[PDB]
Design a binder for this molecule. Structure first.
Ligand code: SPH
Ligand code: MYR
Ligand code: MYR
Lengths: 268, 283, 60, 5, 60, 50, 268, 5
């Protein structure tokens, strides 16, 4: 626009929170579907839903991670990454059922002299592969659900050989997208790339996706966020560059059914 | 209103260009694929396009019966020490690999299922005895119904379970089943557990397998030879073919690139190197 | 209750048609019609919030 | 009777 | 003498119909139509002489 | 039996109900062949005593 | 009504909770005002309010107390008594501001051979008198706010003589309504009486009352519930009768403003 | 001829 508006400069406001950016590469709406509340024709639990609106549909910033030349990649699951986030988390643990969409904003700035490219992928049902070749489908609830810290990818598969006290965790190999399929094809999932010369952020608007209208948020993650270095970090001629990556995520149109006492999960 | 068998778009003739319009330049960071066609970057002629995508519609891509299991049964001499073998199979498309890989291009699906049964038999002992023509009973035992413990126990009455009595040497048996999921679609992937581990409860008590939903998702097929024991032993195999008819699919996925290892997405050490050597500047 | 549809005739020797009658109450028993629809790939190829004009800069 | 597509 | 009825279509790929012709004189030979009726449970759930109004006291 | 529905004792939302009782009609409940007996017969050698 | 409807037989339903009673003495709506949300013409904080609706506007049952011949009376403060009640309490501690109305249902059944009468009073700004004659207005936050356990009245004023480590609690004398005014006049406050021969419950619907449209629920209690034996418990010829008293209270039309991190109060 | 339900 002749009044200055740009693809690269955006402002997002949800609840009492605002994000600004001056180096965006537009933003993505997964499968072209904006988040919505559950329609009566698709409804299933009959009790009056709780809809926290601004109390939960606001931007929550997770712990900042660090990108280096040896970084193989990071992953988070939703709603798991937000289970301890203010009133969203409370609403989640107090109800049997819950559904939610999300605005995911990945942040990573650097300088005109740095280079590198992060693939930011939102994957529906992001089932990851386990560390075991003695027992399949064995990753424990606690290890499958890291909360906000997330998990990481590895360049090497290493099988858990402790049979007496097994680690019971994922071993997500990066070129296999942590799930036995080639990473070069992950672009069929809703994505953006943070290529440092071009943009300093990724924004993905995710609808609630599932084979059900509503489900157990505590038992099941709907979306996975996978961030992998498609082109490695590099800067000037420093051997050990570092730049931070921050995730800020906002629940959208979230509603909950089946209110009771609060869930107190075994997380360690 | 565009149908799967419609011809694709014609190529329109296009000439030389010198402008500020830059179709060739783009920015994949946005997450979009550049929608170009040849006339955007070269001079084209007019072509009337006749080709269609009819054979790659979701229906056409899946419109084939695939083998999902082989069930073994027998009918021995009455004098044997070993029990007459009847088969029990937990219904699934994950015991074989080809249909599984095709369905797993997608996260979710809906379809009516056609099951076709091919039945073959043979002799085993270097005998000279014969056997009269066998009838097989294929009983569907849905989750909750009594699973047969013996080839001849009360469950084979089937008052309510659906059963097929197949006669050997006749056309392969076939039935259809509706979309029977308890969800609005079949989940090819379930990133979750069937149990929440609670703090106030023991770890064993809160535990469950990763990615597994209903333990007995769809029940079992139980197959037997209905004929009584025969002096000469005959062994038979029932091959099961699954075809997804009237199918819908959602959320595309990269296909399985390393060998399947169990019903989940797990992989085995030593199978993780699908790609072969090829030099960057070698055609 | 007969349904009459046309064949897309490939090799040739008017419209040639074929006939279909459903014999069963359950639609699950029906054969596949193969009368299927196509859609535009945009939800996967162009999932961006602002409409893309291919002759224009993707970034402005 | 007859449908026609 | 053909009977044409509609299928309740569950999974999808207008009204889809199916056709039925009875081949025998005896109705006992016919297949089951499954075109069945429902009724209210009242003769078993509310067999009381005085009509029950659920917001009111059952005993007055 | 008290003819209650959820909106009688809790707050409910509007739901458009699609489920039916088609498979539990008396006809559908019984629409299966059940085994009621097994009859045994034979055909022996002519020389048999039985 | 000729179809059987009675003053004495009521059903109350809020959220996923229902109360029934067969021995009511009608119910009271304090000052004739039903609870309402804050109107735009009276609004003050400008941020979008949170309105939890069924998640918080439901019946919460507090710990049951016991009525005996030596009971002098009990008191609770609102919202304090509900500060730990499910999502109402969460919403309260996450927000600077909050307002709420309440349905208060006091429960106490006995038998046709028992007797006694409880005065159940809802008092706006129920300021109680302290235990000290060395320092006025000295009751600590912790002692002023018992939460759901509430507090009790006494027949005797006893001044705290420990000057070195003062108790800093209330000393609410029953005939003085715990505040220096005569109990026989407490009937000018919205009330009901549970007189055992007549009724087994009291129901008071309380509007949000205050000199402001909204306020700090954590700093300030709007209503006090005071229950005093106007006529002592008695039964047959037993010297030590006991009957339980249960309080069930539901927030109504509650809304909150000023969302931030959660308040973690010093309560002991 | 044809009945229709
Ligand atoms: C007389 C033979 C009757 C046979 C009846 C078979 C009924 C059971 C149908 C099973 C449907 C299997 C569909 C495939 C698998 C699921 O997609 C995934 N694991 C997700 O739910
Ligand atoms: C519509 O179907 C009316 C025309 C009927 C044409 C002849 C039907 C051929 C035989 C169908 C038998 C019924 C199948 C159960
Ligand atoms: C009504 O039935 C008139 C239409 C006839 C349609 C064709 C009938 C198909 C063959 C039926 C044979 C008779 C069965 C004994």
């Amino acid at each position: 626009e002749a009044c200055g508006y740009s693809d690269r400069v955006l402002q997002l406001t949800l609840g009492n929170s605002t994000i600004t950016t001056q180096e965006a590469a537009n933003s993505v709406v997964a499968y072209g579907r904006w988040p919505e509340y559950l329609r009566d024709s698709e409804a299933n639990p009959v009790d009056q839903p709780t809809e926290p609106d601004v109390a939960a549909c606001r931007f929550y910033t997770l712990d900042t991670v660090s990108w280096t030349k040896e970084s193989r990649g990071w992953w988070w699951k939703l709603p798991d990454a937000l289970r301890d986030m203010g009133l969203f988390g409370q609403n989640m643990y107090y109800h049997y059922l819950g559904r939610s969409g999300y605005t995911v904003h990945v942040q990573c700035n650097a300088s005109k002299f740095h280079q590198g490219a992060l693939g930011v992928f939102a994957v529906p049902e992001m089932c990851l592969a386990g560390d075991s070749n003695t027992t399949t489908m064995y990753t424990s609830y606690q290890n499958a659900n890291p909360g906000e810290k997330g998990g990481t990818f590895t360049g090497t598969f290493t099988p858990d050989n402790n049979q007496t006290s097994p680690a019971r965790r994922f071993c997500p190999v990066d070129y296999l997208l942590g799930n036995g399929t080639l990473l070069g094809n992950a672009f069929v999932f809703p994505h953006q790339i943070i290529n440092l010369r071009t943009n300093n952020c990724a924004t993905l608007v995710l609808p609630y996706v599932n084979s059900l209208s509503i489900d157990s948020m505590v038992k099941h993650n709907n979306w996975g966020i996978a961030i992998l270095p498609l082109a490695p970090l590099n800067f000037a001629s420093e051997s050990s560059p570092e730049i931070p990556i921050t995730l800020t995520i906002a629940p959208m149109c979230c509603e909950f059914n089946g209110l009771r006492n609060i869930t107190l999960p075994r997380l360690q | 209103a565009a149908t799967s068998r419609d011809a694709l778009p014609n190529t329109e003739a296009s000439g030389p260009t010198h402008s500020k319009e830059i179709p060739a330049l783009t920015a994949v960071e946005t997450g979009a694929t550049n929608p170009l066609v040849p006339s955007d970057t070269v001079q084209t002629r007019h072509v009337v396009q006749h080709r269609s995508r009819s054979e790659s519609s979701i229906e056409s891509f899946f419109a084939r019966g695939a083998c999902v299991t082989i069930m073994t049964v027998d009918n021995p001499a009455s004098t044997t020490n070993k029990d007459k073998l009847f088969a029990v199979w937990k219904i699934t498309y994950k015991d074989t690999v080809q249909l599984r890989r095709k369905l797993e291009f997608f996260t979710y699906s809906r379809f009516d299922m056609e099951l076709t049964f091919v039945v073959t038999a043979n002799f085993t002992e270097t005998n000279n005895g014969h056997a009269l023509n066998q009838v097989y009973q294929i009983m569907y035992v849905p989750p909750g119904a009594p699973v047969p413990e013996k080839w001849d126990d009360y469950t084979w009455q089937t008052s309510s379970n659906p059963s097929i009595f197949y006669t050997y040497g006749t056309a392969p048996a076939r039935i259809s089943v509706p979309y029977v999921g308890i969800s609005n679609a079949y989940s090819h992937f379930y990133d979750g557990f069937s149990k929440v581990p609670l703090k106030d409860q023991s770890a064993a008590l809160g535990d469950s397998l990763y990615g597994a939903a209903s333990l007995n998702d769809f029940g079992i097929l139980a197959v037997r030879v209905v004929n009584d024991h025969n002096p000469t032993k005959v062994t038979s195999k029932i091959r099961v073919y699954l075809k997804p008819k009237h199918i819908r699919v959602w959320c595309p996925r990269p296909p399985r690139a390393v060998a399947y290892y169990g019903p989940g997405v797990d992989y085995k050490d030593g199978t993780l190197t699908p790609l072969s050597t090829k030099d960057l500047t070698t055609y | 209750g007969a349904q009459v549809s046309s064949q897309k005739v490939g090799a040739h020797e008017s419209t040639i048609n074929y006939t279909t009658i459903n014999y069963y109450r359950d639609s699950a028993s029906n054969a596949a019609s193969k009368q299927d629809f196509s859609q535009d790939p945009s939800k996967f190829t162009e999932p961006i919030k602002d409409v893309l004009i291919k002759t224009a800069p993707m970034l402005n | 009777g007859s449908s026609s597509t």
